[PDB]
Symmetry: C2
Subunit: 263 residues, 2 copies
Amino acid sequence: PPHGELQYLGQIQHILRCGVRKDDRTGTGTLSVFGMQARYSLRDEFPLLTTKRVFWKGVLEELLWFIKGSTNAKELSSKGVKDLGPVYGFQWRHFGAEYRDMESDYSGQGVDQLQRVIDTIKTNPDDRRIIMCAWNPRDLPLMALPPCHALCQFYVVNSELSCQLYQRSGDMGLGVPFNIASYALLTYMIAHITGLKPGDFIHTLGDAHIYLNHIEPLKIQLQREPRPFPKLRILRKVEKIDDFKAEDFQIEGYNPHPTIKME
Amino acid sequence: PPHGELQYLGQIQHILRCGVRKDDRTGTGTLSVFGMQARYSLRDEFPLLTTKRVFWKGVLEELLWFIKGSTNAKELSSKGVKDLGPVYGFQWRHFGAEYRDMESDYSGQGVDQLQRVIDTIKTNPDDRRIIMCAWNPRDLPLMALPPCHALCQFYVVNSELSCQLYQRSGDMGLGVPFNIASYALLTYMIAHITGLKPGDFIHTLGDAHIYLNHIEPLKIQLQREPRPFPKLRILRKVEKIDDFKAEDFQIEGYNPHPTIKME
């Protein structure tokens, strides 16, 4: 079968070739294509991109921090990756709650979107509503009922857990490789907790774009040949999504080309 | 260039070939694939499928009814297509409003999602938040903050308006061809009102499925060759989305294979 990373590289190449100039909200230029999708198998491999080195430890640490529901920057800066307001973690665990402090106690305030996804997979694996949403926090005060920045839809069939992430815009150079790994990791965790095998990660974008200053590095990244994806091992049987810790995970066989600094 | 309907037919054929058995919430069986996408040009053609006859008049009438914000069934039954509660129209025009009657006056109650999409395209065409959402009404009383059934994200670049519809599940036999036409029509209307040319319609699904009783008819539909898509003419300069009427639209050059009854 063809290497899963070829989709990411085909998408870069399609944007370079067919993308149209468009400014982002700071008036910084991009090449843009609207509507893209890629599917990465999670079956016995883990889609941590190999045409550049992806900061796996930051992917893992940031996801655990989101899952703990934290809005404290220093809780992520101390584990080593560098009050944020109602960031993704707060919205995953306390959705719709009126945000106050980063110290405040939020037990049973708002909808726990993430536990609801896991509970729905256990009570009804066929459910077509196994969906979590996140907001860009800067949109919250801008208007009533602002639209979501991203949604994850989960799906189970034949003991396999799949996830589709829809993001209204995707920074192909910097954000995309990192998010492929984050949400593939979230799928692996949720699969492990609900007793399922990881299936596919489907990544869908609205405005898929490349920043102008990333074109040159991506052109070079495009000549590199992917190496077989690594595997992700979970080392301990874990019961609750809140119990995972960084040391429960081991990336095995990761053999990337060198780091590319974008920006 | 290849005919746009080949994507729909390739998707059917991929589901027949690779789809997995899965039950829907009434325990009725389907063949299912998770995560699909197709893009249909709207530039000088209109994606009304030709491998079967699509009930265009019902597509048009139902969309005008949604846009008028109506929750009265007889307002759609009298124009000829056969109190519904807070259906799609009410959510498009009066989003987040506490639903009462179908007779009740809702002027300035809730967010007008549809006018907000049109106003945002006029005030900031680059905006990455040009998004409307709809809910399956049966989900509304089921839990707090239930997930959306579908979202439309719009996108403008080089005077062209594109739309991406994400639906958490797609009935490929009955609902999909009809929705391709409805949302392509919504794009044409919004383009016309904002002075833009229609771009692409991107249709993205979570659970793309075929009901078991539709397999045979779709197998036959698969041997039919698409004919060039028709065009859609808008006959009058229209100013406000509320002013369109059925007679402002003419489908031209529509040459379909025969009707297939599904179900």
